[PDB]
Every structure is written in structure tokens, then in C-alpha cells.
Amino acid sequence: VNIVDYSDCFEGISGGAIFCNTKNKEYNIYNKELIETRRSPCSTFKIVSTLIGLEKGVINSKESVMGYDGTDYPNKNWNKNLSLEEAFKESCVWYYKKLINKVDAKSVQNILDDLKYGNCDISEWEGDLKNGKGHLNGFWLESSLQISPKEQVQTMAKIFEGDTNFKKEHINILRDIMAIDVNDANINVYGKTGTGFDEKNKRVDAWFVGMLEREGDTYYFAIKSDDSNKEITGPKVKEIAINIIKKYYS
Ligand SMILES: *C(=O)N1C[C@H](NOS(=O)(=O)O)CC[C@H]1C(N)=O
């Protein structure tokens, strides 16, 4: 465990980072207190909910559809019968809500328990209804389920090193749809953003979680901001994460 200083890449934004290479158990940690603090995963839960849906047969491939019903949404790309790949990349809430609501709560509880997914608390299945957004809510969106950045990395490692019971075919579907382009062909980066606002503490939950492959070595990582500035989003923390990867992990 090496404590490191990534502050320059954070460019004044409050946050922390953890990178882990499980081949040589080297843990690089910036802001240890924050890296161990549990918070809502927000849209980073799509990594796990995709695997749940695949395991239960609700979806089957990166083409799979969830039967769009014509409801009007402000994001143009949500207004279609989009595939799993598109729903993941567009963070389509209705698709992932419909997917998870086809799965019984005990199945979800047991999968989160097996993954050690933070507090594994799905008690508020409906999510944070007091925000007024109704069915555009759930236990993983600023609600009962909470996970620390370190636990995110531990979960990512368990999944992608083949240490869970999820099918290898399903893990490869997730790998494919998580791949991002960082304009450097010598590293393969995979990840997912998440954005929430913690109404209790007046702080954002801005995430980028994923993995980095660079010539035989693999690093599992989680970058997290808790800034009070509502402008700080998942996509913004992904930029920060990419800056760290290019500076320290290339
Ligand atoms: C996920 O955190 N969410 C879904 C959607 N995409 O967020 S992301 O760009 O950080 O991946 C909008 C924000 C949030 C939500 N409100 O559900």
C-alpha cells in the first residue's frame, strides 16, 4: 500500500483515487479516508446490474432489447428500442429500471452479498422518491445502497479476474461495452461514470470506476469526487482519471 499524491490531476477538485494491481498486490491510494468511505454508486451500478440481467436471462447479448414503449424522454437516444450496448453507453435509466424490476429481490440480495458489494442494502428498492422523479429512481441512485471506492475496486477485480460465478461470456459482454477510447493504443481502458448529489451532506457523488490493461499488467481503479460544487460530474471525474492514467500508468 503506497500513499500517493494525485492532487495536480484533480485540478482543485476534492476527491480521491485508488489503483490496484492484484498480480503484485500493489495498492496506490490518494485520499485514504475518502477511498474507504461508502457512498451511493449511482450509474456505476450498471456494471453489476448488467451482469445480473445477463445471469437471470432478462438480457442475453450486447444486442438485447427491453421493449421500448414510446414514453417521451428529454434525451433523444432514450426514445428508441435501444440495445444493451446503447443503453449502457447512454446510461438509459428506463432500460435499466425495467431490467432490474424483472429480477426478484432475494436474487439481487444474494448476488450483492456474494460480490461483497458495499453495505448490500437494497431495502429502499424504489429509491429516493422524495426527489420527485418517481420511477426514474432506485436503490442504487442516492438511496440505500452504498459502496466505498476501495470496495468498487475489489468487486471489479473479482469479476474481471474470473473469481465470481458469472459466465465468462457475460463478463466479456461487459468488457466490450465498458471499453473506452483514450487516444492511446498502448493502454486498454474500461470504465463507467456515475453522478449523484448527496442531499444530506450537500456534496456530489461523482465516479469513474473500471480497469486499465497495459502489457501484461492490469490495474483496477476507482476515482471519486465529493466536491460541494454541483458542476462536478462523473464525466468530469473521468477526465481526471484519464489524466492520472496517462501521467502515472502509461
Ligand atoms: C448515473 O449516475 N446517472 C444516470 C445518468 N448518467 O450519469 S453518468 O453520465 O454519470 O453516467 C444521469 C445521472 C445519473 C442519474 N441521475 O441517474
mmCIF file of C-alpha atoms and ligand atoms in Angstrom:
data_model
loop_
_atom_site.group_PDB
_atom_site.id
_atom_site.type_symbol
_atom_site.label_atom_id
_atom_site.label_comp_id
_atom_site.label_asym_id
_atom_site.label_seq_id
_atom_site.Cartn_x
_atom_site.Cartn_y
_atom_site.Cartn_z
ATOM 1 C CA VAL A 1 0.000 0.000 0.000
ATOM 2 C CA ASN A 2 1.574 3.240 -1.236
ATOM 3 C CA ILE A 3 0.021 6.590 -0.370
ATOM 4 C CA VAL A 4 0.358 8.849 -3.417
ATOM 5 C CA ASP A 5 -0.415 12.462 -4.292
ATOM 6 C CA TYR A 6 -2.584 12.856 -7.397
ATOM 7 C CA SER A 7 -3.753 16.352 -6.411
ATOM 8 C CA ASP A 8 -2.295 18.002 -9.518
ATOM 9 C CA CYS A 9 -4.547 15.903 -11.767
ATOM 10 C CA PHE A 10 -7.588 16.773 -9.663
ATOM 11 C CA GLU A 11 -7.043 20.453 -10.578
ATOM 12 C CA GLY A 12 -8.520 21.768 -7.347
ATOM 13 C CA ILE A 13 -11.467 19.342 -7.080
ATOM 14 C CA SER A 14 -11.958 17.435 -3.815
ATOM 15 C CA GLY A 15 -11.626 13.687 -4.306
ATOM 16 C CA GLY A 16 -9.502 10.570 -4.125
ATOM 17 C CA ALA A 17 -8.257 7.678 -6.217
ATOM 18 C CA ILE A 18 -7.275 4.039 -5.777
ATOM 19 C CA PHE A 19 -5.420 1.817 -8.273
ATOM 20 C CA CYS A 20 -4.780 -1.866 -7.539
ATOM 21 C CA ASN A 21 -2.678 -4.420 -9.414
ATOM 22 C CA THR A 22 -3.559 -7.811 -7.960
ATOM 23 C CA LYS A 23 -0.650 -9.641 -9.612
ATOM 24 C CA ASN A 24 1.833 -7.843 -7.331
ATOM 25 C CA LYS A 25 -0.784 -6.626 -4.780
ATOM 26 C CA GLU A 26 0.409 -3.007 -5.220
ATOM 27 C CA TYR A 27 -2.301 -0.632 -3.903
ATOM 28 C CA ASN A 28 -1.832 3.063 -4.845
ATOM 29 C CA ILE A 29 -4.100 5.317 -2.775
ATOM 30 C CA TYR A 30 -4.757 9.074 -2.874
ATOM 31 C CA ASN A 31 -7.000 10.332 -0.035
ATOM 32 C CA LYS A 32 -7.263 7.150 2.029
ATOM 33 C CA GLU A 33 -10.102 8.491 4.194
ATOM 34 C CA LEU A 34 -12.250 9.132 1.138
ATOM 35 C CA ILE A 35 -11.304 5.839 -0.582
ATOM 36 C CA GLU A 36 -12.699 3.900 2.415
ATOM 37 C CA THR A 37 -15.960 5.914 2.686
ATOM 38 C CA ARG A 38 -19.143 4.252 1.390
ATOM 39 C CA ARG A 39 -21.341 6.306 -0.960
ATOM 40 C CA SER A 40 -24.137 5.638 -3.431
ATOM 41 C CA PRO A 41 -22.657 4.028 -6.595
ATOM 42 C CA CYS A 42 -25.142 5.861 -8.846
ATOM 43 C CA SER A 43 -24.755 4.844 -12.516
ATOM 44 C CA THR A 44 -21.627 2.784 -11.793
ATOM 45 C CA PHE A 45 -24.090 0.144 -10.582
ATOM 46 C CA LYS A 46 -24.796 -0.582 -14.270
ATOM 47 C CA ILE A 47 -21.625 -2.709 -14.236
ATOM 48 C CA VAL A 48 -23.274 -5.098 -11.776
ATOM 49 C CA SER A 49 -26.891 -4.727 -12.933
ATOM 50 C CA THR A 50 -25.860 -5.682 -16.466
ATOM 51 C CA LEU A 51 -24.346 -8.925 -15.139
ATOM 52 C CA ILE A 52 -27.429 -9.622 -13.017
ATOM 53 C CA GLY A 53 -29.670 -9.188 -16.050
ATOM 54 C CA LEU A 54 -27.473 -11.483 -18.140
ATOM 55 C CA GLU A 55 -27.310 -14.132 -15.411
ATOM 56 C CA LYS A 56 -31.101 -14.153 -14.995
ATOM 57 C CA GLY A 57 -31.770 -14.228 -18.742
ATOM 58 C CA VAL A 58 -33.538 -10.853 -18.777
ATOM 59 C CA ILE A 59 -30.970 -9.911 -21.467
ATOM 60 C CA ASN A 60 -28.646 -12.179 -23.432
ATOM 61 C CA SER A 61 -26.189 -10.190 -25.581
ATOM 62 C CA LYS A 62 -24.994 -6.703 -26.345
ATOM 63 C CA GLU A 63 -27.893 -6.501 -28.869
ATOM 64 C CA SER A 64 -30.608 -7.337 -26.328
ATOM 65 C CA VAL A 65 -33.626 -5.024 -26.103
ATOM 66 C CA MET A 66 -36.085 -4.222 -23.279
ATOM 67 C CA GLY A 67 -39.222 -3.420 -25.274
ATOM 68 C CA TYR A 68 -39.373 0.388 -25.509
ATOM 69 C CA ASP A 69 -42.977 1.547 -25.026
ATOM 70 C CA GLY A 70 -42.882 5.000 -26.628
ATOM 71 C CA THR A 71 -42.595 7.115 -23.451
ATOM 72 C CA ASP A 72 -41.200 10.612 -24.106
ATOM 73 C CA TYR A 73 -37.777 11.472 -22.626
ATOM 74 C CA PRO A 74 -35.574 14.565 -22.998
ATOM 75 C CA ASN A 75 -32.515 12.508 -24.065
ATOM 76 C CA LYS A 76 -33.193 11.745 -27.750
ATOM 77 C CA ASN A 77 -31.311 8.452 -27.505
ATOM 78 C CA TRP A 78 -33.624 7.115 -24.782
ATOM 79 C CA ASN A 79 -36.603 7.390 -27.165
ATOM 80 C CA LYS A 80 -35.950 4.158 -29.042
ATOM 81 C CA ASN A 81 -35.760 0.392 -28.642
ATOM 82 C CA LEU A 82 -32.104 0.592 -27.840
ATOM 83 C CA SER A 83 -29.742 -2.325 -27.362
ATOM 84 C CA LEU A 84 -27.861 -3.199 -24.170
ATOM 85 C CA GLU A 85 -24.704 -1.633 -25.604
ATOM 86 C CA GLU A 86 -26.513 1.646 -26.353
ATOM 87 C CA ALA A 87 -28.396 1.730 -23.041
ATOM 88 C CA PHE A 88 -25.122 1.239 -21.170
ATOM 89 C CA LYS A 89 -23.326 3.964 -23.128
ATOM 90 C CA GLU A 90 -26.288 6.366 -22.940
ATOM 91 C CA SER A 91 -26.996 5.480 -19.263
ATOM 92 C CA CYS A 92 -30.640 4.891 -20.190
ATOM 93 C CA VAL A 93 -32.496 4.872 -16.874
ATOM 94 C CA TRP A 94 -35.777 3.345 -18.085
ATOM 95 C CA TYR A 95 -33.974 0.377 -19.669
ATOM 96 C CA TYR A 96 -32.015 -0.456 -16.511
ATOM 97 C CA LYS A 97 -35.021 0.126 -14.243
ATOM 98 C CA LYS A 98 -37.143 -2.211 -16.334
ATOM 99 C CA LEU A 99 -34.321 -4.764 -16.343
ATOM 100 C CA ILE A 100 -33.812 -4.778 -12.572
ATOM 101 C CA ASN A 101 -37.560 -4.822 -11.853
ATOM 102 C CA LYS A 102 -37.769 -8.167 -13.675
ATOM 103 C CA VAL A 103 -35.448 -9.671 -11.000
ATOM 104 C CA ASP A 104 -36.672 -10.801 -7.571
ATOM 105 C CA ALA A 105 -35.171 -9.056 -4.553
ATOM 106 C CA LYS A 106 -33.722 -12.201 -2.965
ATOM 107 C CA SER A 107 -31.746 -12.935 -6.158
ATOM 108 C CA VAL A 108 -30.326 -9.413 -6.122
ATOM 109 C CA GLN A 109 -29.573 -9.593 -2.384
ATOM 110 C CA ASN A 110 -27.665 -12.864 -2.804
ATOM 111 C CA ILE A 111 -25.611 -11.584 -5.758
ATOM 112 C CA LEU A 112 -24.630 -8.399 -3.925
ATOM 113 C CA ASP A 113 -23.766 -10.446 -0.825
ATOM 114 C CA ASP A 114 -21.578 -12.779 -2.936
ATOM 115 C CA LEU A 115 -19.820 -9.766 -4.508
ATOM 116 C CA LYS A 116 -19.447 -8.050 -1.112
ATOM 117 C CA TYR A 117 -20.998 -5.017 -2.793
ATOM 118 C CA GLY A 118 -20.645 -2.446 -0.028
ATOM 119 C CA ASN A 119 -23.464 -2.440 2.503
ATOM 120 C CA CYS A 120 -25.556 -4.651 0.162
ATOM 121 C CA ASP A 121 -28.608 -2.637 1.307
ATOM 122 C CA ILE A 122 -31.478 -2.865 -1.185
ATOM 123 C CA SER A 123 -34.105 -2.039 1.448
ATOM 124 C CA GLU A 124 -35.199 1.105 -0.426
ATOM 125 C CA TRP A 125 -35.792 -0.745 -3.691
ATOM 126 C CA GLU A 126 -37.830 2.155 -5.143
ATOM 127 C CA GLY A 127 -35.030 4.622 -4.452
ATOM 128 C CA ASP A 128 -35.133 8.221 -3.291
ATOM 129 C CA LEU A 129 -38.768 9.028 -4.061
ATOM 130 C CA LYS A 130 -38.625 12.346 -2.206
ATOM 131 C CA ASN A 131 -36.709 13.863 -5.161
ATOM 132 C CA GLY A 132 -39.947 13.678 -7.183
ATOM 133 C CA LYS A 133 -38.579 11.626 -10.091
ATOM 134 C CA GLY A 134 -40.873 8.658 -9.444
ATOM 135 C CA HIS A 135 -39.964 5.566 -11.445
ATOM 136 C CA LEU A 136 -36.659 7.189 -12.530
ATOM 137 C CA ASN A 137 -35.214 6.124 -9.174
ATOM 138 C CA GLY A 138 -33.851 3.038 -7.478
ATOM 139 C CA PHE A 139 -31.849 1.655 -4.564
ATOM 140 C CA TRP A 140 -28.558 2.339 -6.396
ATOM 141 C CA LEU A 141 -29.233 6.072 -7.108
ATOM 142 C CA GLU A 142 -28.568 8.181 -3.956
ATOM 143 C CA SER A 143 -30.575 5.708 -1.915
ATOM 144 C CA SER A 144 -29.954 2.792 0.445
ATOM 145 C CA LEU A 145 -27.096 1.025 -1.400
ATOM 146 C CA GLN A 146 -23.623 2.359 -0.580
ATOM 147 C CA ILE A 147 -20.116 1.213 -1.530
ATOM 148 C CA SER A 148 -16.646 2.623 -0.997
ATOM 149 C CA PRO A 149 -14.163 3.238 -3.831
ATOM 150 C CA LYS A 150 -11.935 0.537 -2.373
ATOM 151 C CA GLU A 151 -14.850 -1.889 -2.400
ATOM 152 C CA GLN A 152 -15.613 -0.940 -6.008
ATOM 153 C CA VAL A 153 -12.063 -1.909 -6.958
ATOM 154 C CA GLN A 154 -12.310 -5.168 -5.002
ATOM 155 C CA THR A 155 -15.562 -6.006 -6.803
ATOM 156 C CA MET A 156 -14.157 -5.056 -10.212
ATOM 157 C CA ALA A 157 -11.140 -7.282 -9.604
ATOM 158 C CA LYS A 158 -13.257 -10.249 -8.516
ATOM 159 C CA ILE A 159 -15.469 -10.008 -11.602
ATOM 160 C CA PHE A 160 -12.842 -9.463 -14.265
ATOM 161 C CA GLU A 161 -10.202 -11.839 -12.860
ATOM 162 C CA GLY A 162 -12.790 -14.623 -13.199
ATOM 163 C CA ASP A 163 -13.319 -15.099 -9.453
ATOM 164 C CA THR A 164 -17.145 -14.946 -9.462
ATOM 165 C CA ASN A 165 -19.694 -17.446 -10.778
ATOM 166 C CA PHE A 166 -20.823 -15.119 -13.589
ATOM 167 C CA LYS A 167 -20.393 -16.709 -17.009
ATOM 168 C CA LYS A 168 -17.243 -15.783 -18.926
ATOM 169 C CA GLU A 169 -19.423 -14.930 -21.951
ATOM 170 C CA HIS A 170 -21.304 -12.414 -19.790
ATOM 171 C CA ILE A 171 -18.142 -10.897 -18.383
ATOM 172 C CA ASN A 172 -16.831 -10.445 -21.944
ATOM 173 C CA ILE A 173 -20.067 -8.672 -22.940
ATOM 174 C CA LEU A 174 -19.455 -6.254 -20.064
ATOM 175 C CA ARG A 175 -15.807 -5.787 -21.069
ATOM 176 C CA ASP A 176 -16.824 -4.945 -24.637
ATOM 177 C CA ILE A 177 -19.397 -2.319 -23.662
ATOM 178 C CA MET A 178 -17.148 -0.785 -20.967
ATOM 179 C CA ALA A 179 -14.222 -0.165 -23.330
ATOM 180 C CA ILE A 180 -13.386 3.476 -23.872
ATOM 181 C CA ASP A 181 -11.100 5.299 -26.284
ATOM 182 C CA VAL A 182 -8.391 7.341 -24.588
ATOM 183 C CA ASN A 183 -6.441 8.076 -27.797
ATOM 184 C CA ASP A 184 -3.551 5.853 -26.666
ATOM 185 C CA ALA A 185 -3.450 2.447 -28.319
ATOM 186 C CA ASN A 186 -0.864 1.178 -25.802
ATOM 187 C CA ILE A 187 -3.352 1.048 -22.911
ATOM 188 C CA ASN A 188 -6.810 -0.522 -22.856
ATOM 189 C CA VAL A 189 -9.122 1.413 -20.539
ATOM 190 C CA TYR A 190 -12.602 0.269 -19.480
ATOM 191 C CA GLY A 191 -14.930 2.089 -17.156
ATOM 192 C CA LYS A 192 -18.238 3.645 -16.216
ATOM 193 C CA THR A 193 -19.176 7.050 -14.777
ATOM 194 C CA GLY A 194 -21.760 7.867 -12.152
ATOM 195 C CA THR A 195 -23.251 11.134 -10.964
ATOM 196 C CA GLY A 196 -25.364 11.897 -7.941
ATOM 197 C CA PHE A 197 -25.856 14.648 -5.419
ATOM 198 C CA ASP A 198 -25.815 13.782 -1.720
ATOM 199 C CA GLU A 199 -28.670 15.909 -0.387
ATOM 200 C CA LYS A 200 -27.751 15.155 3.228
ATOM 201 C CA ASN A 201 -24.196 16.493 3.066
ATOM 202 C CA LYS A 202 -24.527 18.912 0.105
ATOM 203 C CA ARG A 203 -21.818 17.096 -1.868
ATOM 204 C CA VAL A 204 -21.654 15.396 -5.255
ATOM 205 C CA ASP A 205 -21.017 11.701 -5.720
ATOM 206 C CA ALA A 206 -19.015 11.744 -8.962
ATOM 207 C CA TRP A 207 -17.446 8.454 -10.017
ATOM 208 C CA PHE A 208 -15.294 6.789 -12.632
ATOM 209 C CA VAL A 209 -14.676 3.072 -11.930
ATOM 210 C CA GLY A 210 -13.009 0.493 -14.162
ATOM 211 C CA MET A 211 -9.790 -1.145 -15.217
ATOM 212 C CA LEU A 212 -6.606 -0.495 -17.151
ATOM 213 C CA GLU A 213 -4.584 -3.051 -19.117
ATOM 214 C CA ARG A 214 -1.009 -2.164 -20.060
ATOM 215 C CA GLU A 215 1.204 -5.006 -21.336
ATOM 216 C CA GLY A 216 0.501 -7.978 -19.068
ATOM 217 C CA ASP A 217 -0.308 -5.692 -16.128
ATOM 218 C CA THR A 218 -3.902 -4.884 -15.147
ATOM 219 C CA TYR A 219 -4.935 -2.163 -12.688
ATOM 220 C CA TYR A 220 -8.414 -1.949 -11.169
ATOM 221 C CA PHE A 221 -9.324 1.615 -10.247
ATOM 222 C CA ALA A 222 -11.914 3.918 -8.729
ATOM 223 C CA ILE A 223 -11.784 7.720 -8.865
ATOM 224 C CA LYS A 224 -14.277 9.628 -6.754
ATOM 225 C CA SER A 225 -15.108 13.254 -6.040
ATOM 226 C CA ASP A 226 -17.119 14.525 -3.073
ATOM 227 C CA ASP A 227 -16.848 18.208 -4.012
ATOM 228 C CA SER A 228 -19.508 20.652 -2.930
ATOM 229 C CA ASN A 229 -19.599 22.162 -6.435
ATOM 230 C CA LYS A 230 -22.619 20.707 -8.273
ATOM 231 C CA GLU A 231 -20.758 21.217 -11.565
ATOM 232 C CA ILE A 232 -18.538 18.219 -10.744
ATOM 233 C CA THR A 233 -19.955 15.232 -12.632
ATOM 234 C CA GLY A 234 -18.991 11.674 -13.468
ATOM 235 C CA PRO A 235 -17.747 12.727 -16.909
ATOM 236 C CA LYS A 236 -15.575 15.366 -15.230
ATOM 237 C CA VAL A 237 -14.061 12.778 -12.881
ATOM 238 C CA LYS A 238 -13.447 10.530 -15.896
ATOM 239 C CA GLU A 239 -11.266 13.279 -17.405
ATOM 240 C CA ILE A 240 -9.342 13.426 -14.124
ATOM 241 C CA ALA A 241 -8.984 9.639 -14.137
ATOM 242 C CA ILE A 242 -7.699 9.730 -17.712
ATOM 243 C CA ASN A 243 -5.159 12.400 -16.752
ATOM 244 C CA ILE A 244 -3.907 10.190 -13.910
ATOM 245 C CA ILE A 245 -3.659 7.138 -16.170
ATOM 246 C CA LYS A 246 -1.675 8.995 -18.831
ATOM 247 C CA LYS A 247 0.658 10.618 -16.274
ATOM 248 C CA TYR A 248 1.305 7.719 -13.895
ATOM 249 C CA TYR A 249 0.181 4.462 -15.556
ATOM 250 C CA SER A 250 1.369 4.713 -19.174
HETATM 251 C C1 LIG B 1 -25.951 7.792 -13.255
HETATM 252 O O1 LIG B 1 -25.216 8.087 -12.324
HETATM 253 N N1 LIG B 1 -26.901 8.527 -13.673
HETATM 254 C C2 LIG B 1 -27.581 8.183 -14.913
HETATM 255 C C3 LIG B 1 -27.197 9.253 -15.934
HETATM 256 N N2 LIG B 1 -25.775 9.124 -16.361
HETATM 257 O O2 LIG B 1 -24.870 9.546 -15.455
HETATM 258 S S1 LIG B 1 -23.378 9.488 -15.792
HETATM 259 O O3 LIG B 1 -23.097 10.471 -17.071
HETATM 260 O O4 LIG B 1 -22.557 9.898 -14.694
HETATM 261 O O5 LIG B 1 -23.042 8.136 -16.136
HETATM 262 C C4 LIG B 1 -27.556 10.635 -15.386
HETATM 263 C C5 LIG B 1 -27.070 10.897 -13.961
HETATM 264 C C6 LIG B 1 -27.386 9.741 -13.014
HETATM 265 C C7 LIG B 1 -28.853 9.757 -12.652
HETATM 266 N N3 LIG B 1 -29.430 10.926 -12.379
HETATM 267 O O6 LIG B 1 -29.500 8.723 -12.594
#
